[model samples]
Target: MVSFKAGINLGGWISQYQVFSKEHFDTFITEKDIETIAEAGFDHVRLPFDYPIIESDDNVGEYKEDGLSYIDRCLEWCKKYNLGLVLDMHHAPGYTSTLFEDPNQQKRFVDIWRFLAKRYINEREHIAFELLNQVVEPDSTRWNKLMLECIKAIREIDSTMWLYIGGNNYNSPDELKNLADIDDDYIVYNFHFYNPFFFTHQKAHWSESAMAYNRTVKYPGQYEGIEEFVKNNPKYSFMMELNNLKLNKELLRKDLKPAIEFREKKKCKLYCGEFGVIAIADLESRIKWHEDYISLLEEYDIGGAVWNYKKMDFEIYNEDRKPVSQELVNILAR
Candidate 1:
């Protein structure tokens, strides 16, 4: 909530990368990219860093100075560009949102947050911390317990810097109500927006459910055969519920109702930590989707970061590090 109204996520860089080496780390993102983001009108960047960047599974107690240097460089770049940053831990030891059951793993996760709080204690003004990305659990109980523990641990060292927390079931809006409420002004409630999953992740090759969806989908309407497809594919049968619904700008707002209501009830800062459509969606539909999505965000006073700035199948910019479309960039920020 601190200068984080509209932003883009730094995915497939320090986190979720195919190769984990100094070469990829040094080349993936540079100061120029930061400057480009600033010039493009985004006020901040949500940087996701994995645990491997700072500590290896084989050696948990020891820290890697070199991996930490990448974050240091990113921090300096954000300062130079006058942009806020959200340091998101995308991966933690023994937990990936994608496990539970291990007590030692949970402690390691807390240890990492404590370490980060101590490291960036001075940069509270323009920096926020997202505890973990996309938490997938059976219910909110486990995450709620650990989340408070992390918050309490960080507050012991640094309490002023904004902290973001999202609920279970992959930070779904419906799960927001289940979160254990803490009376902290600095805490921001967040949810990931990819609603009516049929459209946002249409043909996303990486997702098993998305990959199974073979037909093309457009914004502001329903696709053909989706009902039958969902009925047959029980694995993604969740889509069956949405098949009867036709989507439009108003429907999009309705899709965001859970988040809207959560904010209204709690009077807390609400944010969409990740939301973007896949490249497989047609350009016109993509633009139309963003236009509607951004409109809802503005109307609800919610802040959000697109799924990615570059790469991860939803890059706002092309592979050459140039804006894919100035119109797309303008719609996102303006």
Candidate 2:
């Protein structure tokens, strides 16, 4: 398997979410932004893209020039900056894992992948592709089946480029065991880590219930207190009901071990393509979370890319936004 040792996600710069606009796409990503990532010691970058950004439903095969040009520019920037790129289809047409789920989404999904496969077949070695982003509930099994078909189609066009396959249900680590059968060397098992979501996403405005006002946990004592609180709270008691729900070293190891072992047996690689705390979270708690998460990842010899490089609600740059946090950079680089 290709070892994409370390990297970071270029999130908000490319993905404008449902409020997608070309303004940010036009001005945000530049050669300097790429150089900044390379200088920070990241060897790779995960570039998020939505279907509408590149292709239109009316003209199936025809790609938008603006979107294609932006991607080309990104590829050029990566080449100039000495970094590899992972093209992640964060939002697919008709079937959005996060919100909308259409019964007929599979056909459109395959078509999109086919077009993508043809476009990047002749691209440089530095470019890789991820099939989808965080597949959610209701028809997740179907999504997995469709994902395999998409991967197969891409493989037919270009087998050498790395492909990432994340599990359904937010790419939970437990589901990695289910994927032990897909033993392709170029395929990297992917997952996102925001363990103890109560802590990392504390007070997140976007959550169903605002977790923003919750207390931040840093050490074992704080974790215990939070655990007790969660157990008592009717809303969060479900976490207590599940096994390995608590965010601790033991639980993390338990969740990660199966995937690590599976990859080793298959002689493949695993990647945490996304992991980070929201900027609204307490700074001290955020730092501790990073330390703990990175420690576990290193223990298993798994490489990862933090959720983002710049602002996306989880900005990693320094307070000034002119440079990345040296402390965070040092932690990930290690």
Best by lDDT: 1
lDDT, residue 89, candidate 2: 85
* Runs off by more than 4 Å, candidate 2: 1-3, 96-104, 138-140, 210-213, 219-236, 239-248, 318-321
Q: The CA-based lDDT of model 1 is what? A: 0.85
How does residue 316 of candidate 1 score in lDDT? 90
Evaluate residue 11 in candidate 2 and report its C-alpha lDDT on the 0 to 100 scale: 84
Over 4 Å off, model 1 = 96-99, 230-238
* Residue 265 in model 1: lDDT: 91
lDDT of 2 by residue, 200-278 (tens): 6766777753352255544222343435556567676655544234566665566567677766666777888888888
Alpha-carbon TM-score of each model against the true structure: 0.95, 0.86
Q: Indicate the TM-score of model 1.
A: 0.95
What is the TM-score of candidate 2?
0.86
